[PDB]
Amino acid sequence: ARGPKKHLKRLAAPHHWLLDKLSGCYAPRPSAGPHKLRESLPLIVFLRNRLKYALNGREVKAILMQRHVKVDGKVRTDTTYPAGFMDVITLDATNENFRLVYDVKGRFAVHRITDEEASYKLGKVKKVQLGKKGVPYVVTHDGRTIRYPDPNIKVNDTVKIDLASGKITDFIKFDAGKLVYVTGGRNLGRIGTIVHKERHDGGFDLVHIKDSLDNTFVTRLNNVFVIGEQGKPYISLPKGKGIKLSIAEERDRRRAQQ
Amino acid sequence: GKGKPRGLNSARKLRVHRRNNRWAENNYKKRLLGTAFKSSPFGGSSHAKGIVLEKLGIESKQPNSAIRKCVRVQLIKNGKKVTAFVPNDGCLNFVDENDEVLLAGFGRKGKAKGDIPGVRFKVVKVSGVSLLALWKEKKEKPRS
Amino acid sequence: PRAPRTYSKTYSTPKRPYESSRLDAELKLAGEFGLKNKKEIYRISFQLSKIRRAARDLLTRDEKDPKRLFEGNALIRRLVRVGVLSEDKKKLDYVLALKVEDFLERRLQTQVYKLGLAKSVHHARVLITQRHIAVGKQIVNIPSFMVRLDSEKHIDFAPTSPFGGARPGRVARRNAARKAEASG
Amino acid sequence: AKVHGSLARAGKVKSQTPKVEKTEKPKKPKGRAYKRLLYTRRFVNVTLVNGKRRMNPGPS
Amino acid sequence: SDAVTIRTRKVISNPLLARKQFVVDVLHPNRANVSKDELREKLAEVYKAEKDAVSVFGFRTQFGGGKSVGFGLVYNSVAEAKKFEPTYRLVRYGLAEKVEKASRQQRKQKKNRDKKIFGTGKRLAKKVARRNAD
RNA sequence: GGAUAGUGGCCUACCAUGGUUUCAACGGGUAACGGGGAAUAAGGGUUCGAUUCCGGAGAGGGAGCCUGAGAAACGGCUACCACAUCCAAGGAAGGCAGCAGGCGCGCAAAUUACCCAAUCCUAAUUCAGGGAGGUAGUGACAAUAAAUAACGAUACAGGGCCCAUUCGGGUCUUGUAAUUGGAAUGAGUACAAUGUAAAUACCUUAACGAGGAACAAUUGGAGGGCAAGUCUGGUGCCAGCAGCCGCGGUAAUUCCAGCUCCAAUAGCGUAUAUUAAAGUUGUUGCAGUUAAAAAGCUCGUAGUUGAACUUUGGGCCCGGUUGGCCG
RNA sequence: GUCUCCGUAGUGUAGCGGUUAUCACGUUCGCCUAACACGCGAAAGGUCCUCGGUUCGAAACCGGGCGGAAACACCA
Structure with missing residues (x-):
C-alpha cells in the first residue's frame, strides 16, 4: 500500500514466538536482517519471554544499549534484530552463551553451549x-x-x-547417510538420516529423512539443514534430539515424571 | 429413476433445475426480488414514525361486531398514507392529530391479523412515551 | 484492535418448554438439591449433552485408535477425578449412561449437606454465600464447585469465620454490647 | 360502508368499572425460597387430589 | 502485620541489569494487607541490603484473605537503582520528585502555536507591536 | 519501433481477420469489497458476513503533477463542478468515511476526559513524539457467576412404632401460624491498605451497616394447541380480547378490575429478518390417474446414461499387527 | 420569535350586538324478533375557543390569551 509496511498486529505474528493475545494489539515486527521475519526471533521477545531476564520493553532497550549481548560476534543494538536458526548470542555477563536451535515441538529453545562451541x-x-x-x-x-x-x-x-x-x-557434502535438521514446515525440528531422494526436475525437491527410531518422513529440500554425518553431529543437539514422541507417549512420560 | 438425473457427471442439470424450482417458494421470491425495499410501506424496517393525520374508525369483518378505533398516519421517510391500530382500551384519548407515533408490525408478516380489515400495523409509542406506560398510568404524555 | 475475548453460552433451553412431565421433574431435582433457577438444571444438562456427544463420537471409532484412546482416557480420567464415575465403570460406555443427578451430587452444596454441617440444603446455600465455609485454605462462596474426591477431606470451616472460632461476629457484638452496657 | 364511525364510546368500560385497591399481604419469599415453597406445596403437602392433582381449585 | 512470614519464590539473578528478581509470597493472617513500605523494610535484611535498594509491585490479595502474591526486585547500588528503576516507581517511594509539565492539552496547543511562527519570534513580536501599537 | 523499472496492443506504423459464446459469453439488477469466519441444526444443508485478522478501494465527484526507494498521496499541491468560511469588496483560507463533538437522516448507535504507565512504530535516536494505543466515563448490544434469605424453640396437623393402662403421653418427624426467640453475612457506607503514570474500580479488611413498614423482583398468561379458575364485581356483538380456532347481542371459565394459580427470572414481552421445525426445496429426501403437477404426438443436438469379454487359479516361503497353552 | 388567514353539536357545520339555531349524517327513545334485519313510529344533542371591556344589551364592535390552519424569523 503505497510503500512498505512497518507494523505487526498481535494476531499475524508467527505462532512459534509463543506470544499472547491480550498484552497489546501489536507484535515486535523484526527489522530487515539476515533472516526472514517469519523464520527468525526478535531480540526483544527472546530476552523478555524466553529468558525472562527483562520484564518490560525499555528493560530490553536498556540492556541492549549497555553493550551486553553479542549475536554472531557482533554486539548489535536493535531491539527487533531478526535472530533465526544458527544464531549464537554471547553474553559477557552471566557467563552464558545461547544458541538458537529449534525444538522437537515446533518452537525455539534456550540450549546452552560451551564457549568453544560458540566460536563456530x-x-x-x-x-x-x-x-x-x-x-x-x-x-x-x-x-x-x-x-x-x-x-x-x-x-x-x-x-x-x-x-x-x-x-x-x-x-559437509549432501549425500545419503547424513544427519540433518529440518528447518520449516509441519515436520520442523526433526533430526534424522537421509536414505534417498526423488529429484523431480520441476521444483520442490523431496528427501526421505529417517529418524533413529525407524520413523520416516518427507520434507522439501529447501527446509533441510545437514548438521553432520551419520552418528556424529557437528553441533550439540538439543535435548530430546527430535524423537517426536506421539501424544500417548508424551502423556506417559509426564505421568512417569510427576 | 424417480424423474431426476442420477449420473456421476450430471450436476449442472440438478443445480439449474433447483434454481428455477426454488422460485416457486414464497420466501425465496420475497427475499431475492426485494419487494420489501420497493412495495412494503415500512421499507424493510421494524418500526416507523409518522404524523397522525386523522382519527379513523373501521368495522369488523363477518362473525364479529366492534369498531377497532384505528388511525391514519403518514410515514416520514416514505411519505405514504398508512393505517395503524391503537391496541389497548381507552387509548385514542392519548393520541391526537399532528402527533409522532412509532408504528410497528402486527404479527402476520404483512397480512391483517383479525377482524380489522386492511390495518396491518399497531401504534406502540406516541409523543416519545410508550402506550403501555400511559395505559398503566406509569408515565404521563408530554404536553408540548 | 486487540484480540476479542471468547464467550459461550453454558445452558440450553428445552425445545418443549411447556410440558407437565418435564416441569415436575426439574422442580423435584431443584428442590432436592437446593437450586433457585432452573437454568442451573439447564446448565448441568448442557454439560451432560456435550460430554455425551464427545463420547458418542469416540464410540464410532475402532479399538486401538490413537485419537479414540487418548481423548477417551482423558475424558474418563477427568470424570473419575471429579467423582461422577466410579473406578469400576471406566469403560467409555457408562459415560453415555450418566444422568443429571450424578453430576448434581458432586456439587459442593450437596457435599456440605452430606458431611453434616448445614442440616438443610437451603442452609448450605446461605453458608456458601456468607463465606462461612472454605475449601482447603481458600474461602469459596460459589455453590457449584464440583469437588473431585481429593478436596472432599479438605472441606471444613474457614479460619476467618465466627462458626469455626475466630472473631465472634457482627450481630453478636451488637447484642453483646447492648447487654453488657445494660448490665453495666 | 363507512369509515367515520362514532368514536365517542372509546374507553367506556374502562370508566364504568369500579375501583379496587390491592390490599397488602404477607410477603411471598423470592428466589430459592419460592422454589422451596413450590416443592413443599406441589409434592410434600399436596392437599386436593380428587382423581387428578389440581393446582388452583375453586370454591367447591 | 502479624506473622508476615515473607517467603520468596522463583529467585533469579541478572548481572545484566544488576538486579535479582523473585515473586514474593506474603501471608497476612488476621490482618488486611501489608503496606508496600512494610515488605520493603524487611526485604533489606533478608537480602542483606538497604531499604532504598528494593522494588516490589503487584500484591493482589488472594480471595478470602490471608495471602498476597507480588513480584519483587532488589538492586545492588543506589546509582544502579536510579539508572534502571523507572521514574514512576522512583517518585513513588522517596527516590525522586515528579515535576508537573502542565498537561498534554496545553503542551500540544503551545507546540502548534510555536509551529505557526518561523523563527524565535523576537523580531516578529517587535514588528507586530510597532504596527499594532495604535 | 516507441514507452515502462520490466514481459505484454501498454502505445504507434503495416499486414492477416481473427477472439468469446446454450459447458450460460455478452447485457441488466445487486437492501454485492472478498476471504478467514458467524447463527442454525443427527447427517445433508440453508442464511448471513460493513464490523477487531489478511488481501483490496477511497479522503466530496473526477482529472493532472512535484518530492521521495516507495504516492498518482489529499491531516501534499494544481485545475473544473457541486458545497462552504473570513472580508475595512482588493483578496485569502478549507475538505472529520482520523480522535471527541455539532446539525441533518432515521426504528437504530457514547465523553468536545486522562496518560505514553503498559503493546509497538518513527527520528540523528535508550531520554523525544504518536486521539497508533492504553485508562476512565456513558452503556441491560451480546456472555459468566450470583443477593433478595436461612436456622432453633412454642399454638396446631401428621408417618412409621412403644405401651394395648380407656380418645393419655406420644418420644423422632414435616408443614400451617393476628407465636416468639437467638446466631449470619451480603447490597450500601471505606479509617486504611493494595490497585493504578495519578487515579476510578476488583480483592483484602478496622469501624458503621435487616425482623419485614423492612435493604419491598418484575415481565406475560390462566378455553384449546400451551401449564395456569366453571372464583368474585363491572360491561352487555358496546367497550374490547385473540399470532390460529374464536369470545362479548343482561347467567363472559377468553373482555375490564380483585383473589388465587402457573410460566421465565434480573429478566420477560413485542415487531421485523433468518434458521431448525420443512420429507413445504426433497443429491441424501417430495409429488404428477382423481388434492397443483406427463408437453397433442414424433423426429432430434448440446447434455445425461450406455451389453459382455482381455490374469485366473495353484502352491512355496518370509517378516509385522491382534489376541493365545505356559503367566 | 414576529406577522398574516380561519375557529361555530357527536361527525357535519350552518346562522346571525338589543335574541344559538338549522341541516343531513349521526345520538338516543317507543317499534318488532330471540337477537335481529330492513320496515319503521318519536325526540335527546352549542361559555358561539378563553379572558377582558365596549356594553340597556356582544359570540359576532374592539383588543389580549389559547387552539388549530399558514408564513417569515431564531449564531451562549
Whole structure:
C-alpha cells in the first residue's frame, strides 16, 4: 500500500514466538536482517519471554544499549534484530552463551553451549556463483558472503563458519547417510538420516529423512539443514534430539515424571 | 429413476433445475426480488414514525361486531398514507392529530391479523412515551 | 484492535418448554438439591449433552485408535477425578449412561449437606454465600464447585469465620454490647 | 360502508368499572425460597387430589 | 502485620541489569494487607541490603484473605537503582520528585502555536507591536 | 519501433481477420469489497458476513503533477463542478468515511476526559513524539457467576412404632401460624491498605451497616394447541380480547378490575429478518390417474446414461499387527 | 420569535350586538324478533375557543390569551 509496511498486529505474528493475545494489539515486527521475519526471533521477545531476564520493553532497550549481548560476534543494538536458526548470542555477563536451535515441538529453545562451541557456526549455502572480477563466492542461509570458497562446495551443503574470522573451515557434502535438521514446515525440528531422494526436475525437491527410531518422513529440500554425518553431529543437539514422541507417549512420560 | 438425473457427471442439470424450482417458494421470491425495499410501506424496517393525520374508525369483518378505533398516519421517510391500530382500551384519548407515533408490525408478516380489515400495523409509542406506560398510568404524555 | 475475548453460552433451553412431565421433574431435582433457577438444571444438562456427544463420537471409532484412546482416557480420567464415575465403570460406555443427578451430587452444596454441617440444603446455600465455609485454605462462596474426591477431606470451616472460632461476629457484638452496657 | 364511525364510546368500560385497591399481604419469599415453597406445596403437602392433582381449585 | 512470614519464590539473578528478581509470597493472617513500605523494610535484611535498594509491585490479595502474591526486585547500588528503576516507581517511594509539565492539552496547543511562527519570534513580536501599537 | 523499472496492443506504423459464446459469453439488477469466519441444526444443508485478522478501494465527484526507494498521496499541491468560511469588496483560507463533538437522516448507535504507565512504530535516536494505543466515563448490544434469605424453640396437623393402662403421653418427624426467640453475612457506607503514570474500580479488611413498614423482583398468561379458575364485581356483538380456532347481542371459565394459580427470572414481552421445525426445496429426501403437477404426438443436438469379454487359479516361503497353552 | 388567514353539536357545520339555531349524517327513545334485519313510529344533542371591556344589551364592535390552519424569523 503505497510503500512498505512497518507494523505487526498481535494476531499475524508467527505462532512459534509463543506470544499472547491480550498484552497489546501489536507484535515486535523484526527489522530487515539476515533472516526472514517469519523464520527468525526478535531480540526483544527472546530476552523478555524466553529468558525472562527483562520484564518490560525499555528493560530490553536498556540492556541492549549497555553493550551486553553479542549475536554472531557482533554486539548489535536493535531491539527487533531478526535472530533465526544458527544464531549464537554471547553474553559477557552471566557467563552464558545461547544458541538458537529449534525444538522437537515446533518452537525455539534456550540450549546452552560451551564457549568453544560458540566460536563456530554451521551454515547451509544457498547459491554458488562466479562474481565480479572472477571471484567465486557462496551464500549461506544467514546471507553471509564468503569469497574464494572450496571448489568442492556446491549447492545444498553446509559449511562451518569460523564466525570470529568469517572464514570457512569445514564443509559437509549432501549425500545419503547424513544427519540433518529440518528447518520449516509441519515436520520442523526433526533430526534424522537421509536414505534417498526423488529429484523431480520441476521444483520442490523431496528427501526421505529417517529418524533413529525407524520413523520416516518427507520434507522439501529447501527446509533441510545437514548438521553432520551419520552418528556424529557437528553441533550439540538439543535435548530430546527430535524423537517426536506421539501424544500417548508424551502423556506417559509426564505421568512417569510427576 | 424417480424423474431426476442420477449420473456421476450430471450436476449442472440438478443445480439449474433447483434454481428455477426454488422460485416457486414464497420466501425465496420475497427475499431475492426485494419487494420489501420497493412495495412494503415500512421499507424493510421494524418500526416507523409518522404524523397522525386523522382519527379513523373501521368495522369488523363477518362473525364479529366492534369498531377497532384505528388511525391514519403518514410515514416520514416514505411519505405514504398508512393505517395503524391503537391496541389497548381507552387509548385514542392519548393520541391526537399532528402527533409522532412509532408504528410497528402486527404479527402476520404483512397480512391483517383479525377482524380489522386492511390495518396491518399497531401504534406502540406516541409523543416519545410508550402506550403501555400511559395505559398503566406509569408515565404521563408530554404536553408540548 | 486487540484480540476479542471468547464467550459461550453454558445452558440450553428445552425445545418443549411447556410440558407437565418435564416441569415436575426439574422442580423435584431443584428442590432436592437446593437450586433457585432452573437454568442451573439447564446448565448441568448442557454439560451432560456435550460430554455425551464427545463420547458418542469416540464410540464410532475402532479399538486401538490413537485419537479414540487418548481423548477417551482423558475424558474418563477427568470424570473419575471429579467423582461422577466410579473406578469400576471406566469403560467409555457408562459415560453415555450418566444422568443429571450424578453430576448434581458432586456439587459442593450437596457435599456440605452430606458431611453434616448445614442440616438443610437451603442452609448450605446461605453458608456458601456468607463465606462461612472454605475449601482447603481458600474461602469459596460459589455453590457449584464440583469437588473431585481429593478436596472432599479438605472441606471444613474457614479460619476467618465466627462458626469455626475466630472473631465472634457482627450481630453478636451488637447484642453483646447492648447487654453488657445494660448490665453495666 | 363507512369509515367515520362514532368514536365517542372509546374507553367506556374502562370508566364504568369500579375501583379496587390491592390490599397488602404477607410477603411471598423470592428466589430459592419460592422454589422451596413450590416443592413443599406441589409434592410434600399436596392437599386436593380428587382423581387428578389440581393446582388452583375453586370454591367447591 | 502479624506473622508476615515473607517467603520468596522463583529467585533469579541478572548481572545484566544488576538486579535479582523473585515473586514474593506474603501471608497476612488476621490482618488486611501489608503496606508496600512494610515488605520493603524487611526485604533489606533478608537480602542483606538497604531499604532504598528494593522494588516490589503487584500484591493482589488472594480471595478470602490471608495471602498476597507480588513480584519483587532488589538492586545492588543506589546509582544502579536510579539508572534502571523507572521514574514512576522512583517518585513513588522517596527516590525522586515528579515535576508537573502542565498537561498534554496545553503542551500540544503551545507546540502548534510555536509551529505557526518561523523563527524565535523576537523580531516578529517587535514588528507586530510597532504596527499594532495604535 | 516507441514507452515502462520490466514481459505484454501498454502505445504507434503495416499486414492477416481473427477472439468469446446454450459447458450460460455478452447485457441488466445487486437492501454485492472478498476471504478467514458467524447463527442454525443427527447427517445433508440453508442464511448471513460493513464490523477487531489478511488481501483490496477511497479522503466530496473526477482529472493532472512535484518530492521521495516507495504516492498518482489529499491531516501534499494544481485545475473544473457541486458545497462552504473570513472580508475595512482588493483578496485569502478549507475538505472529520482520523480522535471527541455539532446539525441533518432515521426504528437504530457514547465523553468536545486522562496518560505514553503498559503493546509497538518513527527520528540523528535508550531520554523525544504518536486521539497508533492504553485508562476512565456513558452503556441491560451480546456472555459468566450470583443477593433478595436461612436456622432453633412454642399454638396446631401428621408417618412409621412403644405401651394395648380407656380418645393419655406420644418420644423422632414435616408443614400451617393476628407465636416468639437467638446466631449470619451480603447490597450500601471505606479509617486504611493494595490497585493504578495519578487515579476510578476488583480483592483484602478496622469501624458503621435487616425482623419485614423492612435493604419491598418484575415481565406475560390462566378455553384449546400451551401449564395456569366453571372464583368474585363491572360491561352487555358496546367497550374490547385473540399470532390460529374464536369470545362479548343482561347467567363472559377468553373482555375490564380483585383473589388465587402457573410460566421465565434480573429478566420477560413485542415487531421485523433468518434458521431448525420443512420429507413445504426433497443429491441424501417430495409429488404428477382423481388434492397443483406427463408437453397433442414424433423426429432430434448440446447434455445425461450406455451389453459382455482381455490374469485366473495353484502352491512355496518370509517378516509385522491382534489376541493365545505356559503367566 | 414576529406577522398574516380561519375557529361555530357527536361527525357535519350552518346562522346571525338589543335574541344559538338549522341541516343531513349521526345520538338516543317507543317499534318488532330471540337477537335481529330492513320496515319503521318519536325526540335527546352549542361559555358561539378563553379572558377582558365596549356594553340597556356582544359570540359576532374592539383588543389580549389559547387552539388549530399558514408564513417569515431564531449564531451562549
